[PDB]
Design a protein around this ligand. Structure first.
Ligand SMILES: Cc1cc2nc3c(=O)[nH]c(=O)nc-3n(C[C@H](O)[C@H](O)[C@H](O)COP(=O)(O)O)c2cc1C
Length: 147
């Protein structure tokens, strides 16, 4: 299967998780493409992919709850081509904040509204990939079960 992992990361944490997921998922035999959301154009972004994984870190303040680069992309979700495709979401955040990884449920929410099938429980965790390999590895296995 073909997987696109698009992430918004401001200190490299979610970027980290995204590299790890690519690693684990390629070891599962699949073609993976890793895309920084700062470099992504929403229009037809999902063409050709069997599954799309969305990474987005949590930022309660100034920023309209989402990571910068991901907010610009998320607001164009209906241009991506998500109808009929498999989708899952993951984030890095901090439990000490009132709303922990709030982008997770919204990504799942909008995707599903645009006709995508959510294939794994959304990953909410703190730090980078190495901070919590067990959380990353579960997310990956769940995705890999739907590929
Ligand atoms: C300005 C500021 C606001 C934050 N707001 C939230 C938030 O409300 N919810 C949350 O879960 N984490 C919040 N965090 C934690 C960050 O999202 C956390 O450091 C995360 O790992 C960063 O991910 P990234 O490096 O991939 O962008 C905040 C951190 C900073 C410093």
């Amino acid at each position: 299967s073909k997987v696109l992992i698009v992430f918004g990361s401001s200190t490299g944490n979610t970027e980290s998780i995204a590299q790890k997921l690519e690693e684990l998922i390629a070891a599962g035999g699949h073609e993976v493409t890793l895309l920084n959301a700062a470099d992504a154009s929403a229009e037809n972004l999902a063409d050709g992919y069997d599954a799309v994984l969305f990474g987005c870190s949590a930022w309660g303040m100034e920023d309209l709850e989402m990571q910068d680069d991901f907010l610009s992309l998320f607001e164009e979700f209906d241009r991506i081509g998500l109808a009929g495709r498999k989708v899952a979401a993951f984030a890095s955040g901090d439990q000490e904040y009132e709303h922990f990884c709030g982008a997770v449920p919204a990504i799942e929410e909008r995707a599903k509204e645009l006709g995508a099938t959510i294939i794994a429980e959304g990953l909410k965790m703190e730090g980078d990939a190495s901070n919590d390999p067990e959380a990353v590895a579960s997310f990956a296995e769940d995705v890999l079960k739907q590929l």
